[PDB]
Amino acid sequence: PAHELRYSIYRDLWERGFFLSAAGKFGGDFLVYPGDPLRFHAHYIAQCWAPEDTIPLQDLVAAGRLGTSVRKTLLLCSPQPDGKVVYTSLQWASL
Amino acid sequence: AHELRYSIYRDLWERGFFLSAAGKFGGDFLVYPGDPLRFHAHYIAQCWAPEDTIPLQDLGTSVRKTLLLCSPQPDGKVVYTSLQWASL
Amino acid sequence: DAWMGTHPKYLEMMELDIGDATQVYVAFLVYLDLMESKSWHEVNCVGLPELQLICLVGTEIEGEGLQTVVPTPITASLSHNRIREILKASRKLQGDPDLPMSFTLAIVESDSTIVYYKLTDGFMLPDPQNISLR
Amino acid sequence: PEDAWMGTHPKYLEMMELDIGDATQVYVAFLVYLDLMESKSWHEVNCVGLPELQLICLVGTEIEGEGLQTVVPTPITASLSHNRIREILKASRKLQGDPDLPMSFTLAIVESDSTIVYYKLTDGFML
């Protein structure tokens, strides 16, 4: 549609290093931010999961021993048959 | 994949986050909290099919904001045109 | 008033035989604004028949280089493609291919007032690192 | 194999008597119990059976007086859906006694070599 239009642009802007905000109104303007002023801020590493999909923990153990996931927050994101989406933060814990 | 990823993008957009979902990150994408206090210089962008006529009446610009026209071409490449209030 | 109809610069733009009387009038309006109100060093009109456009190619200050001004009535409309075409035409006219393609769009409202907009290929923020309130 | 002695331990037998899970599940629950009490210095660790979820979890006070945390021992090869995680979050809140923090539990992932990696999972957006 005119809805493939926005995808191609969004992807190209992403590939070029920009950040997109307020880009959910398909029919409206969106915002395009230079990456460099923003990227060094705290952020999530986010992941799209169908709610029934199994998330292989083998990668989360590689992260654990190589010290790769320590100061990081991973964001699990799943939309429900509700229409809503549910969010779980996942952080390495020292104990 | 796709319709399912964009349902999350739009929810994060509606909550005020910045997103980057470049192909570099594999299936992952990066999510940054919005800042309601600070204005960061940015483009206000528009998606246009290359042939659609844009009405010139449908036209806010300064050092921190620029209007950005975007159109994908047949060859998969998108072209960008910045639009700025001129001080003549 | 009607005196515009016989002004030599108006008549020279019409001998381009590009577009109709309003496109000539709009381009004449902007020519007068650049040369009278904004005090440009020199303004020349050029026709490009393939795009059916009257351009003003000017030098704002005697030392600097050429820039392309494109008058258009507020009523007109442009595709992004057409804007790209004007960018590529401006690159020839300004002779500056080492710089991003650009031109100035001179939009004439119905009451004849002129607002100017600079259009540049690519990503132009005057200060991409700027941080301000709100 | 080298660990058949753990079947004698009273907290192993307590976990096994929950009649939840196979030997790998009971074993990794027991391994996490030992880690929390010896490799950390946890005050108390209690085991609790959630048979609806067919999960054993450990509920404990990392420090005396401090609130209770839920630790969910899991082999490296288990299957975890996001939906399953949400159900563990909801059950975890009941075991913690519906406080005021957002739902969270700790997932204790156990590799075949008995290394344990701990991840905190929390409802929503943390950092």
Numbering used by the authors:
A (entry chain C): 215 to 309
B (entry chain A): 216 to 274, 281 to 309
C (entry chain D): 37 to 170
D (entry chain B): 35 to 161
Authors' text:
Introns of human transfer RNA precursors (pre-tRNAs) are excised by the tRNA splicing endonuclease TSEN in complex with the RNA kinase CLP1. The human TSEN complex consists of two catalytic subunits, TSEN2 and TSEN34, and two structural subunits, TSEN15 and TSEN54, all expressed at very low copy numbers of ~100 molecules per cell. In humans, TSEN2 and TSEN34 are each predicted to harbor a catalytic triad, composed of Tyr369/His377/Lys416 in TSEN2 and Tyr247/His255/Lys286 in TSEN34, responsible for cleavage at the 5′ and 3′ splice sites, respectively. Here, we show that intron excision is catalyzed by tetrameric TSEN assembled from inactive heterodimers independently of CLP1.
We re-cloned, co-expressed and purified the proteolytically characterized fragments, which readily formed rod-shaped crystals in space group P21 and diffracted X-rays to a resolution of 2.1 Å. The asymmetric unit is composed of two domain-swapped TSEN34 molecules, each binding one TSEN15 protomer at their C-terminal domains. The domain swap is brought about by a short, structured N-terminal α-helix/β-hairpin element of TSEN34 that is liberated to hook onto the neighboring protomer, presumably due to the truncated N-terminus of the molecule. The two TSEN15 and the two TSEN34 molecules in the asymmetric unit are very similar with average overall RMSDs of 0.37 and 0.50 Å, respectively. In one TSEN15 protomer, an elongated C-terminal region (residues 162–170) is visible, which is stabilized by crystal contacts. TSEN15 and TSEN34 display the typical endonuclease fold with the latter harboring the Tyr247/His255/Lys286 catalytic triad as also found in archaeal and eukaryotic endonucleases. In the interface between TSEN15 and TSEN34, two structural water molecules are found, which are coordinated by hydrogen bonds to backbone oxygens or amide groups of Ile110, Ala112, and Leu114 of TSEN15, Ile269, Leu271, and Gln272 of TSEN34, and the side-chain oxygen of Gln272. Furthermore, a YY motif in TSEN15 (Tyr152/Tyr153), which is conserved in eukaryotic endonucleases and archaeal α4- and (αβ)2-type endonucleases both stabilizes TSEN15 by hydrophobic interactions and the dimer interface by hydrogen bonds to the main-chain carbonyl oxygen of Leu274 and the side-chain oxygen of Ser283 of TSEN34. The imidazole group of His116 is central to a hydrogen bond network involving Asn117, Arg120, and Asp157 of TSEN15 and Ser292 and Thr302 of TSEN34. However, TSEN15 carrying the His-to-Tyr mutation engaged in complex formation with TSEN34 similar to the wt protein, and no impairment of catalytic activity was observed.
